[PDB]
Design an enzyme around this catalytic site. Structure first.
Site, short mmCIF file in Angstrom:
data_model
loop_
_atom_site.label_atom_id
_atom_site.label_comp_id
_atom_site.label_asym_id
_atom_site.label_seq_id
_atom_site.Cartn_x
_atom_site.Cartn_y
_atom_site.Cartn_z
N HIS A 52 0.70 -1.06 -0.15
CA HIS A 52 -0.13 0.01 0.17
C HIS A 52 1.47 1.40 -0.26
CE1 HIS A 52 -2.55 -3.29 2.73
NE2 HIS A 52 -3.18 -2.73 2.09
N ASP A 88 1.91 1.75 3.45
CA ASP A 88 3.05 0.80 4.15
C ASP A 88 4.42 1.74 3.52
OD1 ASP A 88 0.91 -0.38 4.84
OD2 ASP A 88 1.58 -2.16 3.03
N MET A 142 3.21 -5.79 -8.03
CA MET A 142 1.28 -5.08 -7.77
C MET A 142 1.17 -4.16 -6.46
SD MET A 142 -1.61 -5.36 -4.95
CE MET A 142 -0.94 -6.88 -3.55
N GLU A 173 -10.26 -6.35 -5.01
CA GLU A 173 -10.61 -7.66 -4.42
C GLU A 173 -11.87 -7.68 -3.36
OE1 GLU A 173 -7.06 -7.95 -1.30
OE2 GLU A 173 -7.53 -9.33 0.06
N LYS A 216 -14.68 -9.10 -0.38
CA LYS A 216 -14.29 -9.48 0.99
C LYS A 216 -16.65 -9.05 1.61
CE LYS A 216 -12.64 -9.70 6.13
NZ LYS A 216 -11.84 -8.46 7.07
N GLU A 257 -9.26 -13.48 -2.19
CA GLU A 257 -8.81 -14.66 -1.66
C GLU A 257 -9.13 -15.47 -0.61
OE1 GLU A 257 -6.72 -11.34 1.30
OE2 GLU A 257 -7.65 -12.52 3.09
N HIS A 281 -11.46 -15.10 1.82
CA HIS A 281 -12.50 -13.95 2.29
C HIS A 281 -13.81 -14.82 1.81
CE1 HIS A 281 -10.22 -10.22 2.79
NE2 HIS A 281 -9.87 -10.81 3.15
N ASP A 302 -5.14 -13.62 -3.58
CA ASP A 302 -4.39 -13.74 -2.20
C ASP A 302 -4.81 -15.09 -1.77
OD1 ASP A 302 -3.61 -10.80 -2.09
OD2 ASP A 302 -5.16 -9.83 -0.34
N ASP A 360 -11.54 -12.44 10.25
CA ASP A 360 -10.38 -12.77 8.54
C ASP A 360 -9.53 -13.66 9.98
OD1 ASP A 360 -9.44 -12.93 6.10
OD2 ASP A 360 -8.59 -9.90 6.61
N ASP A 399 -6.47 -14.82 7.99
CA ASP A 399 -5.22 -14.91 7.84
C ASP A 399 -3.87 -15.40 7.89
OD1 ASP A 399 -6.86 -12.51 6.13
OD2 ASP A 399 -5.29 -10.99 7.01
N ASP A 456 -1.95 -12.96 1.26
CA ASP A 456 -1.49 -11.81 1.82
C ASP A 456 -2.54 -13.01 3.76
OD1 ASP A 456 -2.95 -9.66 3.46
OD2 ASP A 456 -4.58 -9.32 2.59
#
Ligand SMILES: OC[C@H]1O[C@H](O)[C@H](O)[C@@H](O)[C@@H]1O
Ligand SMILES: OC[C@H]1O[C@H](O)[C@H](O)[C@@H](O)[C@@H]1O
Ligand SMILES: OC[C@H]1O[C@H](O)[C@H](O)[C@@H](O)[C@@H]1O
Ligand SMILES: OC[C@H]1O[C@H](O)[C@H](O)[C@@H](O)[C@@H]1O
Ligand SMILES: [Mg+2]
Ligand SMILES: [Mg+2]
Ligand SMILES: [Mg+2]
Ligand SMILES: [Mg+2]
Ligand SMILES: [Mg+2]
Ligand SMILES: [Mg+2]
Ligand SMILES: [Mg+2]
Ligand SMILES: [Mg+2]
Ligand SMILES: [Mg+2]
Ligand SMILES: [Mg+2]
Ligand SMILES: [Mg+2]
Ligand SMILES: [Mg+2]
Lengths: 386, 386, 386, 386
Positions: free
Chosen positions: C53, C56, C87, C180, C182, C216, C219, C244, C254, C256, C286
């Site tokens: 991102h 980040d 990406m 994406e 969710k 994902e 998700h 993902d 979630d 992950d 992810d």
């Protein structure tokens, strides 16, 4: 390898391999099986025994004389094969009279009938050598809030189980009861919906030592719960009397897939727990061969139940025996979890300045648990990559 | 109408209206509230009292002298407003030292610290007049199967609660404990995940009479369970010591919506049960004003909690008082559910040919239960269409 | 074996191994990682590249000059390691200004800001060589029904993506967008909640060829859906631009988890599909190393992601190559599923008496599908028992 | 009040009030209804019309002559009552030949039979005046991963719907198709499991304008999704051709409760949306009177469907008309959501320093959304407390 023998104590319900494939949207895809042929075929596959509802073995409505003929033919197939009958149960859900329950139906006369139908089968179960009598209250519940006062229903449920315990005690029978929870289906919500609710209810019965649980993999997963955790709590309470093994893909209708399908890692951790804890009861499969299958598929599916248990048993044993896993368990402080927090007692704990005033909270917080390395070792073992 | 007064016993946690709106994906959207201002604002809205974690009231790490100043200012706001403190609890989840649990952490020194932190707050709770001490073991659990031996963890959990019961007994305190279940979040699976599991565990404690449950609407709904059914079982066992009221839309993360949001019909049946059964404890809201809201929205959301309880109380009372509903309850045989199945005893039941040999199973099966008419009367009452 | 190399195209988000462990109930358990150190450590483990991102890489609020310094240091670590950036994405969820969404916020000025923040990062992504730009509308949604008119919100969502497509077309950039989905968390319900909803929405954009999906694992499993089925539908539509990979245990928050954890059999069937279909994009993880772990656990968890993919790749390849599996696939008529139903056309079908008038429905119905034998061969391959 | 009339366009499937109460665990509790008697009773209750599967009206296997007699008697009851038939559908799920699907069965001859059975009923539907033909692919799916290659299955599904569109175009019929999604049950996973997946699939058909969706309340809720959001997306795409109304309590087996039961607030927001958007199709109830009920309960349950729709219609209308709600909608910036983000275009947006360089992100972030006050006004309206 992975060949079952009767010593592995694998058992099957008559209603499992005999499921004809009728579901809420479709007609049967398989013909009915004679109970004698199921006993013979299961024995050839290496099973230890079979279980039954009263109505699987004796068609509902049978005369006392047809009843004797049905039991005699069944006993002959057990004698011919060496198959045992370790558990039996009552059908209190199929007949329309049970549409609002058996033990907790609002109509009192139905509740009395439910008890008499149960008692008749307990006598038969004892005669066939069953050690556990299972109760699954599949119709005990409600679709709407005003239909059932749950406190009164739990009074009726306690009353029924208390009367059954009085019956077995006064007859001198050596049989124990196991309650099988399920959260929903066919009722919108079912009373005693999880292992925990059933364990709590047992502690209010007059003779709690006669009652345990019969948890089913798929049922606890229909509430999104961790089935090995629930089994651990049942073992901790000393109440795991029987178990129903199958597979389920998450929160949906009760699929009753063959054991090993569904949540495979949960099946691994379940087998690890049962074998470590020395569970010595039957490994019972309550599963439905999918209605896509013909009879060859039925027996392949049943064989798969046993095969997957034996593969997972081997993998879990290799995991626990691996020195590197033993090292990792100590790295993650599993040894410390097993040690008492305060065997020194309350006063010593209150006086121990290292437990609070001088405890270095930041250093303790920085210690990693090393759980991801341990879990990858378990994955590697499960997949045979170790 | 629908104005709350302190006599309705509505209470709120400091952490509810004080939630700053930090979630796993976002920063806080509101400034921190001073506990004194929350007490004042809640009193103006008609609340009865507040509850707290130790760390909501005394910032973690405070010196004994800052601690006294924090408590003194708080006590002054209670005196100025007439607000009570009926319940308190310990924060055993926020600090990183608790990342693998408090009472069931694998590290023994963390478990000892968790107990000392708890005992320190029990003293404070008693000093402020709390009657119930809640424990929510939010970090007790696991993300992976090998990280936690659950039988050893339940031994550590029993050990901790037994020591706390020894502490309150030896101090002569008049406080009881309530365990608050939750099935998951923040751990992948949490130990004692439902009302039932907590009720069963209490029966293995050394002094079970000191322990009950503090169920939360949203938590049982995160397992898809029927919250009024679970409350009924807690009342039947005599263990409903406290309750957390909020809303939840199904099986997902813990939303903690205001009470009345989420499953509205379940909120109606819950209020019907609590009022019918004469529950006399606090009506406690454990809710989060959504992080979309500013402080005016916080107080509107809190006011809405109380409003919705009082509307549903009125509707449930009108339902139970309606002669037509009374007629429908008899039509559905709710009166018969409350009558013993076999007050005549086992032998009389076994001798009663009308319970089995002469029971007309087809006539009983044809009787409709009339549950849909009863449920539409309940809908009409809820919507004010009666 | 099972050693990754850059040719396996494994990539990681900066926010994955850099997650500090703050969850809704707890403080961070790990210090922040410098993006340069994550690039270096991931390259040592065999990764191909990283994703980011905007926020980040460049702390929110940075001046244009600090921004250049942050990008320069990052580019130097990519050059030193050979790591790629395939990406990139925008953070439209952490800052409080996005509390009601970015592209679909009710406030128009926030929507304009969201677009400008996105466009600024697309320029940076192109400069770093990214081929896919992902959009995850984590704040686009609602906790209550009146807060969001969804038709107007979908108009605003189409408007935003149309403007981004106009921007990349007019700049001549070679970058495509991936949405994406969710279903929920952090909003009570999120717009475009599944693969299917996102695929349908793309077909209403002005230039649909520029947009695909970035599904994902976890998700789609938060809605109880079958993730390999959804990926198959995305491949069938030609829209699987990125993926993902992670793990999830059912319908809950979630999680992950590392890839391979959660639903292991679904991970096997996913890998089987991606490899069979020749998906050639990045295998992007992810995931969040659990907050129980220290930094050694972070890197073990990341390594485990790649290891599990490569083990499952081997097992799926052995499955498809096994002559006995090839025989079973024909037994279950997978070959016939791939043949057109009526290549002869409508009129021939209508004239074909063997399709209806003379079709032997009972003989067709009796044919078993042999799916249970096929599925046990797949289990045996997964467990290395073949 | 709340009396339905034929002008409210309430319709019912023959299979709804005619459900005999057979579920996977129990026998039928009600006798079969003659379709002529259902038409007569529904007309007396104020319904507009009925819908049917081919096999509800003509018993499977009927000769052409029995077929004509069945249709003639049915047409006479429609003429006598004024009841319409706005929708029809095919039963491709009950007969064992469909155990692995109809359009996507692995056996090619079954797929051809499925198409011929469908085409025969389209002719009948057109003759009875139906405007929509629904397809529910309840058997299209799988219990295991290798049984179904989903890309090939979607090719077969597209092929079947393309052929049906060719058939209706070449016959000149004025009928459109609606696909009804469901995520699971009776198959472990069903293809096109949600509204979104079905909408995406339609865009790959040769003549997409002939196809829309027929969403069902309970089906989207079996995936935990927000049903009004999904309907909004179907309306936005112009594809809401028909709707199935009922109730569901969360993620479990398909309950098909009467409309208004289950998630009551979602029913309110659904009615608000349908009425605001001017949906003019049939309000169709696909529900099952619970098997606890006798025939008086069946008709009470059906009447309740219509009653609850009309109560919620009144409450939603009072909500939207309330000046105070109008004020609150503006306070929450619903008006701004309906205004274009950038009608000034891309270049103007890029040049607008107030959208980025000079945007005061902290002041925008501090604005509360006032959604909780708006939602309590909606609650007050629903409960008749305004
Ligand atoms: O009672 C034994 C069995 O009865 C019923 O068949 C249930 O579906 C099953 O779960 C249970 O184990
Ligand atoms: O312990 C009291 C409260 O603690 C934590 O805040 C939990 O999130 C909440 O559920 C609980 O009631
Ligand atoms: O946008 C990229 C990532 O953004 C956020 O971190 C989400 O939590 C994650 O799901 C998504 O993939
Ligand atoms: O196809 C029409 C109906 O068919 C079946 O009965 C389904 O159970 C129902 O959901 C569907 O609407
Ligand atoms: Mg089951
Ligand atoms: Mg079962
Ligand atoms: Mg069972
Ligand atoms: Mg909560
Ligand atoms: Mg909570
Ligand atoms: Mg709580
Ligand atoms: Mg995720
Ligand atoms: Mg994610
Ligand atoms: Mg992601
Ligand atoms: Mg349905
Ligand atoms: Mg349906
Ligand atoms: Mg339907």
């Amino acid at each position: 390898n992975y060949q079952p023998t009767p010593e592995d104590r694998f058992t099957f319900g008559l209603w499992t391999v005999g499921w004809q494939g009728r579901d809420p949207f479709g007609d049967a895809t398989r013909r009915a099986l004679d109970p004698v042929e199921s006993v013979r075929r299961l024995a050839e596959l290496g099973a230890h025994g079979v279980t039954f509802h009263d109505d699987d073995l004796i068609p509902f409505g049978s005369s006392d004389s047809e009843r004797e003929e049905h039991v005699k033919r069944f006993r002959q197939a057990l004698d011919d094969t060496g198959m045992k009958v370790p558990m039996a149960t009552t059908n209190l859900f199929t007949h329309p009279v049970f549409k609002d329950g058996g033990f907790t139906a609002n109509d009192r006369d139905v509740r009395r009938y439910a008890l008499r139908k149960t008692i008749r089968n307990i006598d038969l179960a004892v005669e066939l050598g069953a050690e556990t009598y299972v109760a699954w209250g599949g119709r005990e519940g409600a679709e709407s809030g005003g239909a059932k006062d749950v406190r009164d229903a739990l009074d009726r449920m306690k009353e029924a189980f208390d009367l059954l315990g009085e019956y077995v005690t006064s007859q001198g029978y050596d049989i124990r009861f196991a309650i099988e929870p399920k959260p929903n289906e066919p009722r919108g919500d079912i009373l005693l919906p999880t292992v925990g609710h059933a364990l709590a209810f047992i502690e209010r019965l007059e003779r709690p030592e006669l009652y345990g649980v019969n948890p089913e993999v798929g049922h606890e997963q229909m509430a999104g719960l961790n089935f090995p955790h629930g089994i651990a709590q049942a073992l901790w309470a000393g109440k795991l009397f029987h178990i129903d093994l199958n597979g389920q893909n998450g929160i949906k209708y009760d699929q009753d897939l063959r054991f090993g399908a569904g949540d495979l890692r949960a099946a691994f951790w379940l087998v690890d727990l049962l074998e470590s804890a020395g569970y010595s009861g039957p490994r019972h499969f309550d599963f439905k061969p999918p209605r896509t299958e013909d009879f060859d598929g039925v027996w392949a599916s049943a064989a798969g139940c046993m095969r997957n248990y034996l593969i997972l048993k081997e993998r879990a044993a290799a995991f626990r025996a691996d020195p590197e896993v033993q090292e990792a368990l100590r790295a993650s402080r599993l040894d410390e979890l097993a040690r008492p927090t305060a065997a020194d007692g309350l006063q010593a704990l209150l006086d121990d300045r290292s437990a609070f005033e001088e405890f270095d909270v930041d250093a303790a917080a920085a210690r990693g648990m090393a759980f991801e390395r341990l879990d990858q070792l378990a994955m590697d073992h499960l997949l045979g990559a170790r």
